[PDB]
């Protein structure tokens, strides 16, 4: 899926940095391997439909008293891994205290950056403890003109890919010469790298084949 190059499931590993003047979308495009859905997803396509490609620049988050290696059975690369540019921040072990952390990132380029994170709405209230500490979690973001607050939603669901818990991926846009801030202690799917739009192109849809000599 067009948004799959931003999270990078085990299928978009060559379009992490894809350079292009043209985009094609298919009936089997899936932005997700661990079930979920973006929030304001179609908006991102139209911008991405005309982005000319993305330059992955590393964001640089250092995880201390936890894991980063977070993995599940759906988003398999080789065995069981996760999205490429996303550290599934489990607790320290398999229930442990996920302490209160806070990270920030800054833009050093004349172009704006694409910032994507996600909440892990766990399938139960225990599976919210299985990967993070117990007690309520609030992941609130900050910017000079963006101020939000999410609460993970622990609740039963349909099983998609054998998993019932979900991951709702959000995004905002960081202007050149500014920052972003995350304060959290749970249910967080961290970003490793943030996209940078390359220029001008076009995305369409079709369900047919291509031709290059015309």
């Amino acid at each position, epitope marked *: 899926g067009l948004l799959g190059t931003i999270t990078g499931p085990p299928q978009c590993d060559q379009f992490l940095e894809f350079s292009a003047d043209l985009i094609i979308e298919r009936r089997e495009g899936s932005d997700v391997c661990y079930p979920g859905k973006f929030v304001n997803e179609e908006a991102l396509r139209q911008i991405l439909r005309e982005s000319g490609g993305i330059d992955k620049e590393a964001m640089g988050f250092t995880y201390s008293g936890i894991r980063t290696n977070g993995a599940t059975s759906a988003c398999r690369r080789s065995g069981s891994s996760f999205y490429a540019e996303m550290k599934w921040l489990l607790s320290n*072990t398999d229930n442990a*205290a996920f302490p209160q952390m806070t990270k920030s990132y800054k833009n050093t380029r004349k172009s704006p950056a694409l910032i994507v994170w996600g909440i892990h709405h766990s399938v139960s209230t225990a599976e919210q403890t299985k990967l993070y500490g117990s007690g309520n979690k609030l992941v609130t973001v900050g910017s000079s003109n963006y101020q939000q607050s999410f609460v993970p939603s622990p609740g039963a669901r349909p099983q998609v890919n054998g998993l019932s818990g979900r991951i709702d991926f959000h995004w905002l846009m960081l202007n050149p010469n500014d920052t972003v801030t995350f304060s959290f202690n749970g249910a967080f799917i961290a970003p490793d790298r943030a996209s940078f739009l390359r220029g001008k192109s076009m995305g369409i849809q079709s369900g047919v084949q291509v031709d290059a000599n015309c």
Partner: antibody
Amino acid sequence: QVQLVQSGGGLVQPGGSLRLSCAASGFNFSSYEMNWVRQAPGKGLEWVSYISSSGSTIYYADSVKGRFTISRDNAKNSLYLQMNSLRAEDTAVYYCRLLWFGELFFDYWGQGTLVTVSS
Amino acid sequence: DIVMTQSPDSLAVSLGERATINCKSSQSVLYSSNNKNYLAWYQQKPGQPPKLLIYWASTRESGVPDRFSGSGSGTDFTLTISSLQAEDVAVYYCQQYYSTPGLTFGGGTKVEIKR
């Protein structure tokens, strides 16, 4: 009833090696976190290593950094501890395990083994 | 890692004496958003493995009679055997299960009854 038992203890000589072993009874093995704790002769307790549910993660201590090797089995009900380059501070008797989890309870330790690194 | 201590090292307090064991910590063990203390009490007799005594700091484990009680919060606690008994001649430890792959116990303490 849940119960545990350790084995593989005796007399060894330092710079040598041993391979400890646990056995279980009365619970879904494959689903929990498993620890390891040793106690030197009349000393305090010490955490050695653990394995997560899927065995996908292991974390040791610094006294055994590169000297010990914890290992699991879920079909068989066994948790292992290979030892290598034994030293004399490694003289101890070994136990362990908890209940992880949040909520409710638990407990639970084994009966033990005499392991001395006296050549 | 979180380094732990107790006092007194050894107390010889007589039968029926409210024995008071004080125990400290370097780093805090009280999680924020659920407000719970990661502290346990155990009872080992030489050759025996530890037996569970108090958890959540202030929650007794079943099978433990009423004289046992855990108190305190944050970095300092205290076990008060309201009526010290002769069954209670054992070694008691504090333990943290805050950080994870390093559970630090203590220095201990024996409680031998006077006369």
